[PDB]
């Protein structure tokens, strides 16, 4: 997989500074289907790509700045514990729902008539 890795990471290196400026030109110049797939979100690996670039984008963040750093690792632990607790609670609520759904009369009918939500299940 060394080839794939290398091309992903390279096009990611350039894509990180030139964005689509050098890659968006390469795709049209070379003509690659493989290159097009790499650019596209259809090809699974694309996702990992979005990672690498981000990472490189990050290295560009503190270029010219040094890091002069236990407490942190503790706080991370704490976070993980918190998240774990949220997961637990969720599982519980779900359980309740299953119970009630299983326990209501689906024969108490009283009808009237007869015959995108993901971005909607947020807040703004």
């Amino acid at each position: 997989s060394a080839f794939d890795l290398d091309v992903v990471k390279l096009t990611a290196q350039f894509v990180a500074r030139n964005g689509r400026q050098f890659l968006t030109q390469l795709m049209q110049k070379e003509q690659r289907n493989y290159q097009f797939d790499f650019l596209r979100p259809q090809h699974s690996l694309f996702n990992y790509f979005t990672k690498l670039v981000e990472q490189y984008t990050k290295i560009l963040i503190p270029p010219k700045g040094l890091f002069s750093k236990l407490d942190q690792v503790c706080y991370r632990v704490e976070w993980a514990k918190f998240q774990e607790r949220e997961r637990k609670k969720e599982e519980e609520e779900k359980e309740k729902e299953r119970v009630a759904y299983a326990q209501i009369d689906w024969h108490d009918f009283v009808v009237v008539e007869t015959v995108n939500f993901p971005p909607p299940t947020t807040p703004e």
Partner: peptide, 15 residues
């Protein structure tokens, strides 16, 4: 069918 604890059940026909 759509149900909530206090309120009464509701149905919608799907030919």
């Amino acid at each position: 069918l759509m149900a909530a604890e206090p309120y009464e059940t509701i149905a919608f026909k799907v030919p």
